Symmetry: C3
Subunit: 180 residues, 3 copies
């Protein structure tokens, strides 16, 4: 019967409708689940990018700081190098020379013993013609048993020479500054 072949067909078609309904429902379920996982992933990505951006900016600053550090090191190393070559050392045994005059406080010492002190004052400067020429300290002066003008005159000359030689020595000390 044509109508009987309609309902048997209807029964088969509803079984198919049931199968489809379940399948569509499952697909919809999965999609909602996938969506949730996706939303969670998107959130973690946002936070990840926030952190990485912070790190990227932070590293940039670190490198800049490292540049300054390298520059400051270069600076202090440069000065130390300069100082090392320019400074007077207390343990070096080879002669050291200054390009300037020198001034110290109480005294100068050689080999632990004092050599030059402060300028000694209270002197009246001698006057005369300084004798820088030949000076014979072993010069002998003859004195006879009777008075001779030339002998005594020779004494006078030697005395005058001696006093002018003293002046020469004194002037030397004064020009150095050892005495006033």
């Amino acid at each position: 019967q044509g109508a009987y072949d309609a309902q048997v067909k209807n029964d088969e078609q509803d079984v198919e409708l049931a199968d489809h309904d379940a399948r569509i429902a499952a697909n919809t379920k999965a999609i909602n689940i996938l969506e949730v996982r996706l939303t969670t992933a998107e959130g973690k990505i946002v936070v990840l990018r926030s952190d990485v951006d912070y790190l990227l900016d932070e590293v940039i600053d670190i490198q800049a700081h490292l540049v300054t550090v390298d520059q400051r090191l270069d600076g202090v190393e440069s000065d130390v190098s300069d100082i090392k070559s320019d400074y007077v050392s207390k343990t070096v045994t080879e002669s050291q020379s200054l390009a300037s005059p020198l001034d110290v406080k109480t005294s100068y010492s050689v080999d632990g013993i004092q050599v030059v002190g402060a300028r000694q004052t209270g002197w009246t400067a001698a006057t005369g013609t300084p004798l820088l020429g030949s000076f014979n300290a072993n010069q002998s002066y003859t004195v006879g048993t009777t008075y001779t003008q030339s002998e005594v005159a020779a004494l006078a000359t030697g005395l005058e020479q001696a006093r002018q030689r003293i002046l020469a020595l004194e002037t030397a000390l004064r020009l150095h500054g050892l005495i006033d």
Copy 2:
């Protein structure tokens, strides 16, 4: 004609059911592809989170190290600065003054030439009253053809003056430390 399109609608309904079947399967396929891709994406996020966490911890330690570094830089710069102002320079042409006494080894030199050496020993100290007053080195002494007491006496006075002036010079050297 109840059997009609009861059967032809069944045909139409079956056509639509087959297409529905095809579409559901296609949707299922897509979901499966999405599921695989999402799972891969989620994993990479997990590893990313791990790496970023590591980077964050390493960077924090680095910043702490940089703090110590800046402090050490400040330290050495300060010290170099102190040294720069306090040290005696060998190339400076302007007069330099020490706050201390000074002791050197063999000798002191001026302009490459030795001026003061070690204290010279072996001296016997002269005795007397040093003459620090007026001393005329150009004093002339008259000697006549006949013996005159005042003339020879003046000679004696001049000699005594000279010798006491020598003592004054000698006293200066000993007080400085140039001789023992």
Copy 3:
């Protein structure tokens, strides 16, 4: 009659098919929406990995740089320490000693006052026997009303002693280098 609810079953089945059609269509579109979001998410993950990989390598370089910095800091700190102990200070009040000879420019000074200058030239070296022995500066010389050989001779000896004492002093300055 059987055919009448054959058509009614068709009507009910049509509602279900229309519902299914919309539901499948909704799933399909939703999947396409997910794909777009997922593709965007994947892209950002790729860029994240690029940045993080860069940072990992960047951090490695930095730690290495930091090691060198500490090595350089130790070096300059050591050098400053060495320089600090070995250098001559302008502000130290305690006597400072050199293990070496010293040379300066124009002069040596004590307490702001010049003591030793450049070596004075133009001297002729005195000759004779230097008197380093006993020297009495307070020695008196008798001169009588009449010529006496021993008295005048004593004068001559006193003169010779003085001149030999001058020689001793001059020798001292010359040996030091204060004079040529």
